Write a protein that binds this ligand. Structure first.
Ligand SMILES: CC(=O)N[C@@H]1[C@@H](O)[C@H](O)[C@@H](CO)O[C@H]1O
Ligand SMILES: N[C@@H](Cc1ccc(O)cc1)C(=O)O
Ligand SMILES: [Zn+2]
Ligand SMILES: [Zn+2]
Ligand SMILES: [Zn+2]
Length: 446
């Protein structure tokens, strides 16, 4: 979503989100940091190629051809500068001139020290409470974007972690057709499609950078959760980590974990699809979690098994047609978890990433809401680690990633929704240690 600078009336009608960085001579003088060498305001590149027929309603949704329904001018930064301003560096780079290489290691959460574990938890909690310095979030769609009196832009501040929750939600939201109409649900800009891995890759990358600056610890790194242990229990659901089960309510978090204080955003789906609003920054109920607790669906009461991971890393093609949740022999669908680990589709199966989510039987198992459970972060860094080792192993072969006729949002050169500045699936489809400034301290079953 957009920087405060662009959540204006002036920017929203220029269609230009190109804020100043060091406005030496006054407003408009140093857009994208062109006083220094750092970048320029420029036309926006966005994918025009067609998408799967599954989504009929082109013309209705503001996530189509993202981000062109809100802005047609963006900053493009030079070299290894990056950021809405070109005010910072590309991932893996720091310094005033973005020429000092940095490499951070995402470790297994259970291998961290007592003080590392505790630093992580309170960082999360701090990110849940601290206002995001950059981004605000839209409470209404583009029609009512400038509010009732056409001169009050409908954006709210929001905490760092809730932004993480909100962007995921905005990408899964249903298409509003009109009051009295039934909203459209066969659309997911981040799941059931080849953008699933790269969307969630950047998602994590933006939370990590935000926490790096909130803590001002450039080396801060997001640990991972090896959820592929075949276990009957959540081995990170302890009070020093992500919170044990409440003894007063089997679906709540132990009051001795700070996460029992957290209150969720984006739970009022009935309001969003009825009135046409969007998730705002007003928190509601608490997190709901009950590992293994879904007695109604026994498939989901046990986590994936270590081989499940070893089998999916042998699926050689990244994705296969129709590039959807029912593709066979697609690595992206296998580790997403709509096929079994060998690649074989079945509408009943749930493996790997999906089954980790379902196992929680709670807030973490509902797509519009699962980031509210901070196990999400650990759940997707591990999903990303598997992605990263597939990229190492098959030499980042993006040939199977379709350029056309993926479900809308999942074409290879689609700008991933709603990240800003616009960033494509291709930009994330690279091995992370050499290109994105991070690596995984991890070993793989064989
Ligand atoms: C203008 C500039 O700084 N370019 C560098 C590039 O030469 C280098 O290969 C890359 C990897 O860090 O980072 C960036
Ligand atoms: N909804 C998925 C699982 C899932 C849940 C929440 C998510 O955020 C993502 C995936 C399923 O049908 O198995
Ligand atoms: Zn350019
Ligand atoms: Zn997701
Ligand atoms: Zn997920």
């Amino acid at each position: 979503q957009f920087p405060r600078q662009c959540a204006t009336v002036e920017a929203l009608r220029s269609g230009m989100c190109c804020p100043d960085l060091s406005p030496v001579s006054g407003p408009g003088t140093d857009r994208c940091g062109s006083s220094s060498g750092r970048g320029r305001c420029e036309a926006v590149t966005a994918d025009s190629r067609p998408h799967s027929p599954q989504y009929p309603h082109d013309g209705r949704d503001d996530r189509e051809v993202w981000p062109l329904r809100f802005f047609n001018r963006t900053c493009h930064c030079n070299g290894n500068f990056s950021g809405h301003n070109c005010g910072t560096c590309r991932p893996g780079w720091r310094g005033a001139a973005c020429d000092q290489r940095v490499l951070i290691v995402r470790r297994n959460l259970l291998d961290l020290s007592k003080e590392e574990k505790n630093h992580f938890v309170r960082a999360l909690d701090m990110a849940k409470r601290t206002t995001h310095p950059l981004f605000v979030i839209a409470t209404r769609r583009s029609e009512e974007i400038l509010g009732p009196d056409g001169n009050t832009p409908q954006f709210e501040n929001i905490s760092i972690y809730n932004y993480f929750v909100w962007t995921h939600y905005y990408s899964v939201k249903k298409t509003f057709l009109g009051v009295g109409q039934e909203s459209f649900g066969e659309v997911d800009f981040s799941h059931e499609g080849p953008a699933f891995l790269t969307w969630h890759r950047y998602h994590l990358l933006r939370l990590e950078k935000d926490m790096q600056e909130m803590l001002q610890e450039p080396s801060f790194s997001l640990p991972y959760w090896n959820f592929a242990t075949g276990k009957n229990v959540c081995d990170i659901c302890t009070d020093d980590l992500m919170g044990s089960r409440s003894n007063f309510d089997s679906t709540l978090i132990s009051p001795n974990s700070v996460f029992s204080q957290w209150r969720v955003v984006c739970d009022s789906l009935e309001d969003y699809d009825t009135l046409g609003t969007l998730c705002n920054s007003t928190e509601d109920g608490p997190i709901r979690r009950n590992p293994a607790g879904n007695v109604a669906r026994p498939m989901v009461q046990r986590l994936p098994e270590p081989q499940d991971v070893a089998q999916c890393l042998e699926v050689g093609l990244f994705d296969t047609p129709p590039f959807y949740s029912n593709s066979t022999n697609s690595f992206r669908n296998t580790v997403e978890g709509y096929s079994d680990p060998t690649g074989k589709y079945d509408p009943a199966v749930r493996s790997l990433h999906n089954l980790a989510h379902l196992f929680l039987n709670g807030t973490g198992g509902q797509t519009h809401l699962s980031p509210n459970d901070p196990i999400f972060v650990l759940l997707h860094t591990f999903t990303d680690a598997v992605f990263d080792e597939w990229l190492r192993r098959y030499n980042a072969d993006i040939s199977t990633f379709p350029l056309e006729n993926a479900p809308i949002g999942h074409n290879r050169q689609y700008n991933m929704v709603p990240f800003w500045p616009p960033v494509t699936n291709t930009e994330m489809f690279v091995t992370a240690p050499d290109n994105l400034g991070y690596t995984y301290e991890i070993q793989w079953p064989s």
